[PDB]
Amino acid sequence: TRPANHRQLTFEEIAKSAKITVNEVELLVMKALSVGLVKGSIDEVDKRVHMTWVQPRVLDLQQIKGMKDRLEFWCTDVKSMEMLVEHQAHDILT
Amino acid sequence: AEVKGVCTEAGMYALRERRVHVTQEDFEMAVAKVMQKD
Amino acid sequence: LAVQKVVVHPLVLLSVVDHFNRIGKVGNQKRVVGVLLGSWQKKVLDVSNSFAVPFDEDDKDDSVWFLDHDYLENMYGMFKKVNARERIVGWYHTGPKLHKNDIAINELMKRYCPNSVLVIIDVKPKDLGLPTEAYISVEEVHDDGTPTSKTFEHVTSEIGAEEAEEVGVEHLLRDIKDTTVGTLSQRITNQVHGLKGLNSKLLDIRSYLEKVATGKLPINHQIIYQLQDVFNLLPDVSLQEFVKAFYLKTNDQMVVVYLASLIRSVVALHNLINNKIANRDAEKKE
Amino acid sequence: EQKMLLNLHKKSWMEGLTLQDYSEHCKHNESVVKEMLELAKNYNKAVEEEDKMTPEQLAIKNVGKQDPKRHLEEHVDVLMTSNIVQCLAAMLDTVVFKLI
Amino acid sequence: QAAELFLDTVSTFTSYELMDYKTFVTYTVYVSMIALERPDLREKVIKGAEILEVLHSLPAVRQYLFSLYECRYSVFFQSLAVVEQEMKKDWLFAPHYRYYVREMRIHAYSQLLESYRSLTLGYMAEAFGVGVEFIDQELSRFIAAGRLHCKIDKVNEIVETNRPDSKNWQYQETIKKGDLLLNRVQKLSRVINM
Amino acid sequence: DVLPPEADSSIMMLTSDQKPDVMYADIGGMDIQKQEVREAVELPLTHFELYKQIGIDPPRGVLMYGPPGCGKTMLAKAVAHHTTAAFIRVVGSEFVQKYLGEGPRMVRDVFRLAKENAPAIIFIDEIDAIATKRFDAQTGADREVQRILLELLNQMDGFDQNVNVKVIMATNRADTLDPALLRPGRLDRKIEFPLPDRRQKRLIFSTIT
Amino acid sequence: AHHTDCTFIRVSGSELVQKFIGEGARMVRELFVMAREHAPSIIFMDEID
Amino acid sequence: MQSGIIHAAEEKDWKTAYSYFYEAFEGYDSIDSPKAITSLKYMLLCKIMLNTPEDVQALVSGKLALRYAGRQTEALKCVAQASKNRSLADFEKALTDYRAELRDDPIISTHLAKLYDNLLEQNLIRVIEPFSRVQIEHISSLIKLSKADVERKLSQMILDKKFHGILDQGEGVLIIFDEPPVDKTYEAALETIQNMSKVVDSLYNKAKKLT
Amino acid sequence: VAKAIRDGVIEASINHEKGYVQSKEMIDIYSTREPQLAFHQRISFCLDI
Amino acid sequence: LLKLFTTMELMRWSTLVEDYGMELRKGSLESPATDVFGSTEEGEKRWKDLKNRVVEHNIRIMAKYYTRITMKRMAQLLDLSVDESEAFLSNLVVNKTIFAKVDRLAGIINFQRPKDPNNLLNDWSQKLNSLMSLVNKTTHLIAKEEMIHN
Ligand SMILES: Nc1ncnc2c1ncn2[C@@H]1O[C@H](COP(=O)(O)OP(=O)(O)OP(=O)(O)O)[C@@H](O)[C@H]1O
Ligand SMILES: [Mg+2]
């Protein structure tokens, strides 16, 4: 659910969401890390879990539309930078 | 020629101890080797 | 897989183009099919020759199609007499994209070469991509419980030439190819072409997603799985650690660039010195 | 046919944006700069020698002996190209592949 | 380079037309304490047989060297004043007697601050046998020059050491020397055009 | 075109499998000869900077001479087995060839190969085949051998102090050797392999038994 | 020989150098043709004995 | 043997002393002399003073030294193990168990102090290795020495650049720093700039002389 | 000091109640774009030369 | 038991004892015990070495997953005291078995080595390469889907 910029889950968040005690949260992450469901690391000093990868899941049509909008923004960025490089280096472009 | 060989042998004795500068002991050992032994 | 890279020689491209043109002189055709001969080097295919075979198909039905396999065997023997080290490694066709009956044709070809490779060679001069697209038949074991079927797994395709083949190509490309451009300009043009190719690939993905959203195509549930990984792989360039590392690396390269430019300027001054001295000597003796 | 043959040695779009390994890139930069160190040390001597050298020896004396100026030019060209290409590719990738 | 050459010829010295051997060894020690790192100074000068044998007859120079090496900073400062008065009268060290001494002072300060995270100003003054105000002025001058990697909290009179990366110190010298070479190139081209 | 220097050589270096199995411990009672060979061959290869610092001029070549069967060729074997440098074993009679010019050509090929693979040791067993002091100008054999010897002298003379190549020549009839081969810069270290003394005899007996 | 700029010729009688002295080699005085070409010359011979 | 003894007494390089002791051991063993063990002892001792204790065991494992395997070789092997483990407590235990064979041999007894100092440095490095910020009292407890002595030794080691760190007296904590290696690229660039400035000076002479 | 801080002369702050000035911790210069800018000026000048 | 040493998760020494020690040390009449963990001196030494292997496996797992961990938490998960766990970790670090920096003043263990800019930018470049490869593969899969449903 969380965007890639905010995939740092506090121990309290996992404990509350999973209906488990805080001291067990780490062990839960261990299983999810061992099976391969998720990827990341655990910072037990700050009681946080840095999650970097998720098992891909079945998406709804609306989620696919949002993904296509993300692709629209990505295509706009790629095209803009391609035109920038073509314009700036036009004289030396082969 | 024997004196020159004594100088070279003093350098060789300095080498055998992995030293850079030739010392008087090296010259005396070279004299002993060049003259008495040979 | 059994195939890591497929190298298609320019002779194969020219033979495919010539076959397509001579068949299309009839004025009624869609694609032509032939057999690919090459050698094997580690896990890298070396497609180096080809020969046309009679082939036809129905425009409407995909199950109706005729391929002359006796012709295939006879010309395989004839080519093997000339070059024994070139064996059947697959087939080709000039259709711009795959066909529903391509799997059946690959099954027919697999008797002659068990790990047959289908190299779709687009005769039309595509501006960005390579004219060749290599595929190998695999048994796709789905996890949805659907029965295992035969699909075409893509294979990285490259155009490589033999020494004499490269000599001939350079003779034919003598006028068109411009080699005066420096290496740096070539790399920057490579970067521009990479940007264009990435834009084209992203636009293809976007078009597929647009068709899926409006229901023109069903949700594959496997392309979506790959796309989630693709979007997860997008790095965060706004991180403090990454920004500091990028700045440090850029400065490390810029100091080297500065040293190189300083040495270049000094060498250029030395060249100017030599030129002025030579001019003064020439005018002094004359 | 000319367009078809033009695809020979045409590099894939992926390696256009592909960045060289930064460890090997730094090692190469350090090695070439260390080479130009000795090359410039010899270049000074080459300038002084060519100051006092007759015009018949401008090329005969260059036979069998490396030219510090030529190797310096080659190293400069190589490092300029490599570092400029790497920097430009990294800067392009920082815009193209972005999370936002 | 003077220290390197002097240490190379400390056991082969025969140039008595230039200086006496005792004077040569004193010069060698003087340049070594300013040009050598602590391990190099220990291996070559502190444990050097010839240098120690000569220093047996030169108590002042041995005191000057070992006070720095053994971190007797007040003794080192007194010996540095004596050494300064020696350099002022030497035609070889006269142009640099102001420079050398200053550098030595920096070295001493740097040494006292090398192993400690932070030092009170009073502790520095007591170690060097000077006033707190003198330590404040000297440390401020040398930090402003960028020679000491520390900052002074005058409110609490605590010098806190820093660990700047060698990359910054290499980059600043790269800028400086590249600018010097670039000025030479520019002026050479200026000469060439006319 | 210009061919790579290591290419175009009829004589090859010793590979790992061609290394002799003779050890220094296998040789008994030649401590003086072992020390002289080590100080003149194997030590300058690894400690040339020390030789320069001290002021010693390392000997370019070594002439091992003595009565037959006194450990010359075996000491060469032990050097080849216990060296980190390239070893180029050759025999003097190999240089004399029917094709005129091939002798000097392969001599300079040997020296070029050694130079390109520095540090290297050149061993020429039975040096009398190309280093006799008498030459008949009207016989093709003596003319070719004179050419071979002159090329050998030139190759040894063209080796500056920088090139890390050591040359070893072995013979049991050094009285017949040309004096020009023993001049400084060619063979500055004549090591004699005399008949064993009583202590040498007992050392050899113990080592062999 | 070095200080007076006189050419130093060593006559060892070696046959290896005979080709340089002359293809005749029947008399040692055939070397004089070379010596006259490098006058002033110092002809040196050392008796090994 | 006397040459090696004098060489070690003058605290010169220990490689030459080891070579002299090796020749003495070979000579004494060839004639089957009772002193061949003594020259063996110092042979191992040099290896300890050369900061290469791992060789000592190999030296004992040789055929010539298998004849002399006894209390002296055991003492030197155990002190080699103490140096190899970088353990000062092992050094003291070795000095206690083999006091007759080590503390009473004058040649070894003379260098025992320097051996103790070297093992002190090694054990301090080993103790502070797993830490990035560690209380000085903990280091003293691990090393079994006074806190003042530990602090003085650590300060001297920092001044000697044996390891990278600082000493916080106010909290009495040693902070160990993972310093980065100097950039060889920048050093080479600086020296290249200097040499190219020399090149520009040569071009200056050529230009002003020829125009 | 307030004018100097506002103008960017020095990176610091003033504690009026305490009555002192706290200088900001020095930032790693080489991890910023300033070395890149200086190298840019020098590189452009060298290429112009 | 072997699966316990193959799974990439934490294993507790107390649970291991209470689940297998009787079957390993004393054994059963149906399945006799080997002399590996017998009551003799060698059996006791091998039992101690088994505990060492268990705690070292736990430290390896905790290094793979955790980036920083409290010394208290490390001791709790190792079934050891703070001093014993710290000593074992120090022994592992000295032998170069496992990298870890112990900020003992704050009671923190850092399994994360300092990030070389080479390493960080190489991770970024590897991410870019994998992204481009996945984009190409997705394009090919899209082509197959277009073929099937056209
Ligand atoms: N010191 C030695 N210890 C043991 N064996 C020896 C020793 N010296 C010579 N030999 C014996 O010499 C034999 C071969 O002689 P070697 O080739 O070494 O002699 P050489 O001097 O090269 O002879 P030649 O002059 O006839 O070529 C070997 O089988 C070896 O056992
Ligand atoms: Mg022989």
Side-chain angles (χ1 to χ4, degrees), chain G residues 15-35:
Chain G
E15 329 204 18
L16 175 74
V17 288
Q18 274 298 330
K19 55 140 53 171
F20 307 120
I21 273 149
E23 283 75 15
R26 302 167 227 78
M27 301 196 243
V28 81
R29 291 197 280 121
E30 261 149 54
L31 163 136
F32 266 122
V33 180
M34 296 180 27

Side-chain angles (χ1 to χ4, degrees), chain D residues 26 29-30 33-34 36-37 40-41 43-44 47-48 50-51 72, chain H residues 184-185 188-189 191-192 195-196 198-199 201-203 206 209-210:
Chain D
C26 264
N29 274 352
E30 164 207 343
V33 171
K34 273 197 287 184
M36 319 203 238
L37 162 75
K41 168 195 306 297
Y43 186 29
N44 189 17
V47 174
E48 319 170 314
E50 90 169 7
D51 164 40
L72 220 34
Chain H
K184 333 208 72 51
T185 305
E191 325 197 5
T192 296
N195 292 131
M196 293 271 335
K198 291 166 178 32
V199 164
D201 294 344
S202 304
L203 290 188
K206 154 175 294 191
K209 283 170 184 174
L210 273 287

Side-chain angles (χ1 to χ4, degrees), chain E residues 38 114-115 117 184 188, chain H residues 160-161 167 183 201 204:
Chain E
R38 172 123 173 151
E114 155 146 47
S115 39
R117 175 196 202 274
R184 300 233 68 181
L188 177 78
Chain H
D160 284 5
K161 280 130 188 70
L167 276 185
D183 197 12
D201 294 344
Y204 250 108

